[PDB]
Design a protein around this motif. Structure first.
Motif, short mmCIF file in Angstrom:
data_model
loop_
_atom_site.label_atom_id
_atom_site.label_comp_id
_atom_site.label_asym_id
_atom_site.label_seq_id
_atom_site.Cartn_x
_atom_site.Cartn_y
_atom_site.Cartn_z
N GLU A 45 15.27 -2.42 6.36
CA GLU A 45 14.55 -2.18 5.12
C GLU A 45 15.31 -1.29 4.12
O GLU A 45 15.26 -1.54 2.92
N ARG A 55 16.33 -2.84 0.47
CA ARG A 55 15.92 -2.13 -0.74
C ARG A 55 17.11 -1.51 -1.48
O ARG A 55 17.06 -1.34 -2.70
N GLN A 109 13.17 -14.78 2.01
CA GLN A 109 11.92 -14.51 2.71
C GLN A 109 11.91 -13.11 3.24
O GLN A 109 10.90 -12.42 3.18
N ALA A 149 12.36 -10.46 0.54
CA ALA A 149 11.12 -10.57 -0.17
C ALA A 149 10.00 -9.98 0.66
O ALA A 149 9.17 -9.22 0.15
N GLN A 150 9.96 -10.30 1.95
CA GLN A 150 8.86 -9.82 2.79
C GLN A 150 8.85 -8.32 2.83
O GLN A 150 7.79 -7.70 2.84
N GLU A 166 7.36 -5.81 -0.14
CA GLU A 166 5.91 -5.70 -0.27
C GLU A 166 5.41 -4.26 -0.34
O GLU A 166 4.54 -3.95 -1.14
N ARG A 167 5.92 -3.38 0.50
CA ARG A 167 5.44 -2.00 0.51
C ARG A 167 6.63 -1.10 0.35
O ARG A 167 6.96 -0.35 1.27
N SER A 171 8.43 0.36 7.03
CA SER A 171 7.67 -0.33 8.05
C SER A 171 7.66 0.47 9.36
O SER A 171 6.62 0.63 9.96
N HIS A 228 -1.92 -3.69 -7.78
CA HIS A 228 -0.64 -3.10 -7.47
C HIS A 228 -0.60 -2.60 -6.05
O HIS A 228 -1.59 -2.08 -5.56
N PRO A 229 0.55 -2.77 -5.39
CA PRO A 229 0.76 -2.31 -4.01
C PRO A 229 0.56 -0.81 -3.86
O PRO A 229 0.24 -0.35 -2.77
N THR A 249 -1.36 5.14 0.85
CA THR A 249 -0.61 4.67 -0.31
C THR A 249 -0.56 5.78 -1.35
O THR A 249 -1.37 6.70 -1.32
#
Lengths: 729, 747
Positions: free
Chosen positions: A84, A88, A388, A391-392, A395-396, A401, A590-591, A599
């Protein structure tokens, strides 16, 4: 050293105990699936010292390394995180590549491979573009030692370690094809021969760099040292699908023995996000133990190696040549689990593999061909899969993760660390205590902000407030004054001392006795009355200054105000002629909007508190707010309710910003967070409390709302902290 | 002008508010009463910088200076504490001297100031007036009006225009009036009734009310005179004399003095900051040379000078002093010549208190004073004459009184009385700071936060040993106890380890891990030790092991197995890179050597001054209660029963100071190896001060890594120094000094 009196002494938990290292090579690539053909990202910590992320051969090819961990579970946690951080950190245009066999391959001129020529020369630059997953497993020393005593036979500990590791390696080679049958992801490549449709695995297959016709000896550490050393007449050239990585030089193995084993057998798995499955890693672990476990010569190994290369070439779809050997191995392995009292999960896994022998399609090799076939191209599925995964993961973006639970201030710190290449240990996942070492230098941080650089007394000062108040006023700053009276007659007398004040009872309920004079202490008689009402409610009443103005929070690190945050009550802007409810739901898409803790932002709700106030605004859930009509839905700024944090660093006047740096320095804190009340951010600072007043000081400042504001430029504080700790970087 | 008429804005509360300072001068003297005739004590900070303790002139004459405080109430705690620190610091041989009047005067001593100018100044001064008159010592009373009340006074007064002129004019008015009526203050509080210094005056026990304010008491000359009528004039007066001839403005002697004065003239821009009143003689009957009631009395009186509308004229002021001199010379027993003036003057004071809504206590005080006008026997001066006759001489009483007070200082040697309430550790630091002279201020008595400032260097300490050098991560490291363990296992220190099992089956399965390891098996949470199994030798059998784990599970959901340790637990106090002390604590006991019963035996051991509340004092008195009585039954002893012959009787099983166990310094007795470990553990923690608790089977044997050899109990980030400073049976190790030095090494 092969024997299992372990079962006779019931040392099941120990054979499982161990450590697991892990490296994964992926190729940096464009959306098309083409090789990136660009330099290693500047953000990433120095290629030389960055432990987690580095480059193997091609600047374009990248290698992710997980620290060794006692539990297979923690390896994946790390891998997940490293991936991740990379996704990013990677440029938007560039992306990671799912499969081992490159889909778009450049000319030799194209690959800079910025930092081997002789090595490069003998097999060429292209073969090196192949990418894989190395799995390293080392037996728990406790386990071995218990085992050594039981063995009457071995006089040397190192021989027994050496022998045990050798046994494991030799054996793994013997049956290493089954692993390859179960999980091979190297069916095709872009470039001489289109080959003999598909193949199980090209790398292991002869036309791979991996496939040497020199006989080394894994029978004896001494023997292997001589076979190896004489071949010179270095370490890099030998291809062992299982590698003796225990020591720097083979000779050292006579002195110190082999510390662990690295397996280079594996292919990336396109189906799994990081190229491995926790189950597969567990499977492998059990398999390595079976190697050691089985009671069980070079030729058998040599035969095994031969069976390995043939199985590779075979079309994945078609039934394996030696399912029989394979079924027998897996069945004994099931037996092995029985006697160790292996957890149930393992049973489920070997079972599924047994299913795979019978159904070739259940095999990782087989499943890939249909899908690749369905994608129509080696490049098409790989490229498809790069988007994918990147992109996956996006998300956050705010949270890692791997450590979703850790506070967001702390999660982010992690990110910075892993991206910058500082080596970190989570001492307490739950208590947010991190230990960071780069080079000899070691620094501990807790909750991100707390560092060595803060004396204890600073926080000690801020907690107390009497002290801060007394210390701050001496600093000469404007501190709001509180006055506390034990006795009311004295209080009437003390009317001369007060200006805008609020009179409240120490302890009152239903807001009883609270009197607010805003611009108001104009008459002595009303003041007296305020005390009386106040005094019935508590034994002691307080008189405090009442200052009206927006309130700001300045994050100060060192000598400068890093950032400024304003908080505003839940609200939606009326720009859209949309149902406020419709308009509200839009703000929650929004996430960053979730519950407040998990969050950065909280999710506004149109409840009766919110509904009620809107009605004060003249609105209903159903009303459409006129363009540019902000409706506030709460009188409370805490984002717990759904307030929006907006960055004011640039907008705020620098007078206060220096005042904030001035205040925190007086406390002696390097990283204090200051809360201030400023009527006019825009107008220049004054000594008069009319411009501003210091409302609080925080020993452990937040970071996260600063890093992830609802609106306004994101100022990243964790790097400022990170740099601060290890300034040398 | 008159502030009196501006009580309309109800400034009675503002009026009382002020800043209060105080300087009391006394001469260190022998029990004999003779002057000390020796050097200033070593223990006190350097005289050049020391703010709390110094010597005015004569090495023998020392003066205690209290830091200004918002309340006259506090100055006394400072005073009480400073005088106690001084009393404890002097060689037992030396005592303090209560009266102003020198007891046995030699013909002597020197300033001993490091700077050349002071020695020249004292030399020129000793030459100007001789040295005997200088010998006499007395209190100074410094009072400053709140700046806020002054601003409010000023806002109403249209007449002045300038804020400072108002400030100068106010103070001046206050000074003048004071001079005219100061005689009233001396009468009440004369303490100098009584050969070498001034035998010219006829004495047959024929005492005057105050010898000092008389002509023989040192006033440098008749000709020197300055006007208080205007600040500008006052300055011209002081200037002209300096020009040509006081050596300087400090050499100006008078009963009231302007101050904040670099030089008089700077007042013209700066204003007058405060006044210093010198009329007062040390009074023999109050322990510290003055009383709160009297300190307060002066304050109200000072206010009264402000309150009255009239300001005394040059004639008035001059008349005032003549009057004051005559009144001071009168015989103590007789009534004052201008007693009505006194009655009238104190009369207004009352109206003033009533008008300002002053405290109930004050009214009590002034009244007492009126009563004193009816019969002089009550006056300090009158009282003094009575007392002087008691042991037959001026000097005899002074020695008896000094003795009486040094004794008081020494009862409760361990605690500083001004701040009895604070932790002992903190009172002890306070003491040391005061003795050393680091300017210290208390920000929160209760939270224990202290502010030590020396020169332009300041450090903030909470709870005695929490300082700047200690960093914040260390405490957090130590809080965890778990994290403590991880940092420590890395350094390689021997730390017992706990393993927690949620599943019993795994626990039995995981048995090998601890076999020939001595483990204590306990449930996470249990009652009456239910389910707790101890294994001192080690876990010998699978079966005995399963039962132990089995039984705990019955008791709790989450079950922890922890490493068993045995030995005598030791507390190393580590500061910096050195271990400063090691302390051990034993179960309450007595020794039967005395042949006294345990009841008599215990009674003797509690008789010790240190013993008291465990909380309010270092050691807690053993109590022979039933829990204590049972322990006796085991020894085959009873309360009445007599321990025999140097026999240790144990009365508790837990070595807790809380229950009267003793504390023993083992700094020297302990092995070097363990000591480095406390320094080693502290290093891993990265803590400057740490108190580290180890469990050690043998003091004497060298340390080995293995737990059987060696072990660590716990790491404490706020070590308990007073236990260390005062062992029951140890050698006292003071750590508060070690702490200060490390704080201000430049000192």
């Amino acid at each position: 050293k092969i024997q299992h009196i372990i079962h006779e002494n019931q040392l099941g938990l120990l054979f499982q105990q161990g450590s697991f290292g892990l490296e994964k090579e992926s190729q940096r690539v464009t959306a098309d699936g083409a090789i990136v053909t660009t330099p290693h990202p500047a953000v990433f910590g120095n290629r030389r010292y960055h432990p987690y992320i580095q480059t193997d051969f091609a600047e374009s090819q990248l290698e992710l390394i997980t620290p060794p961990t006692k539990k297979l579970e923690d390896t994946f946690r790390w891998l997940s995180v490293i991936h991740e951080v990379v996704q990013r950190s990677l440029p938007e245009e560039e992306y990671i590549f799912p499969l081992s066999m490159p889909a778009g391959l450049p000319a030799e001129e194209q690959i800079r491979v910025a930092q081997r020529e002789y090595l490069v020369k003998i097999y060429g630059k292209n073969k090196q573009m192949v990418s894989g997953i190395h799995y390293n497993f080392q037996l728990s020393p406790d386990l071995i030692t218990r085992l050594f005593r039981l063995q009457n036979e071995y006089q040397s500990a190192v021989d027994f370690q050496n022998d045990l590791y050798l046994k494991m390696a030799k054996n793994f080679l013997r049956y290493q094809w089954i692993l390859l049958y179960l999980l091979a992801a190297t069916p095709t490549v872009e470039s001489f021969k289109d080959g003999s449709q598909f193949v199980r695995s090209l790398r292991s297959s002869q036309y791979g760099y991996v496939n040497p016709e020199i006989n080394v000896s894994f029978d004896s550490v001494e023997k292997y040292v001589e076979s190896l050393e004489h071949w010179v007449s270095a370490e890099k050239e030998f291809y062992s699908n299982v590698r003796l990585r225990g020591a720097k030089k083979a000779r050292e193995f006579l002195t110190t023995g082999i510390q662990y084993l690295e397996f280079r057998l594996f292919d990336l798995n396109p189906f799994e996000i990081y190229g491995i499955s926790l189950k597969d890693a567990k499977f492998i672990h059990v398999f390595a133990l079976f190697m050691i476990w089985m009671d069980h010569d070079q030729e058998e190994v040599e035969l095994g190696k031969a069976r390995l290369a043939e199985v590779a070439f075979e079309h994945p779809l078609e039934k394996t040549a030696y399912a029989v050997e394979g079924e027998l191995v897996l069945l004994e392995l099931l037996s092995m689990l029985e006697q160790i009292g292996a957890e149930p999960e393992l049973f489920e896994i070997v079972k599924e593999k047994l299913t795979q022998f019978t159904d070739p399609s259940k095999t990782v090799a087989g499943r890939l061909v249909r899908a690749i076939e369905q994608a129509g191209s080696d490049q098409q599925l790989g490229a498809q899969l790069a988007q994918q995964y990147k992109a996956q993961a996006f998300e956050r973006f705010y949270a890692l993760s791997a450590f979703d639970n850790m506070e967001l201030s702390t999660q982010a710190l992690l990110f910075d660390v892993i991206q910058k290449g500082i080596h970190t240990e989570i001492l307490d996942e739950n208590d947010q205590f991190l230990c960071l070492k780069y080079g000899d230098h070691i620094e501990y941080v807790k909750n991100g902000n707390m560092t060595s650089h803060d004396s204890y007394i600073s926080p000690l000062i801020m907690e107390n407030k009497v002290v801060t108040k007394k210390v701050l006023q001496k600093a000469g700053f404007n501190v709001p004054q509180s006055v506390e009276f034990t006795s009311l007659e004295k209080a009437v007398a003390s009317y001369a001392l007060f200006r805008a004040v609020v009179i409240k009872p120490k302890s009152t309920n239903y807001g009883l006795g609270i009197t607010i004079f805003q611009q108001g202490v104009q008459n002595r008689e009303d003041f007296a009355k305020a005390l009386e009402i106040a005094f019935r409610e508590d034994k002691e009443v307080m008189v405090e200054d009442y200052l009206v103005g927006t309130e700001y929070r300045f994050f100060v690190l060192g000598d400068e105000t890093l950032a400024v945050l304003l908080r505003v009550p839940a609200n939606v802007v009326g720009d859209s002629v949309h149902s406020v409810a419709e308009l509200v739901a839009m703000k929650n898409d929004h996430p960053l909007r979730g519950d407040g803790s998990r969050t950065p932002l909280k999710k506004i709700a149109l409840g009766e508190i919110e509904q009620l106030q809107l009605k004060e605004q003249g609105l209903t859930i159903d009303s459409i707010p006129a363009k540019d009509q902000l409706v506030q839905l709460r009188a409370n700024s805490n984002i717990s309710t759904g307030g929006d944090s907006i960055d004011m660093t640039d907008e705020m006047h620098e007078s206060y910003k220096q005042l904030a740096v001035g205040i925190t320095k007086a406390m002696g804190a390097a990283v204090c967070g200051v809360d201030l009340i400023i009527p006019d951010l825009k107008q220049p600072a004054t000594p008069n409390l009319t411009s501003w007043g210091v409302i609080e000081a925080n020993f452990n400042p937040m970071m996260m709302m600063h890093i992830f504001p609802y609106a306004g430029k994101s100022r990243r504080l964790t790097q400022n902290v990170i740099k601060m700790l290890f300034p040398e970087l």
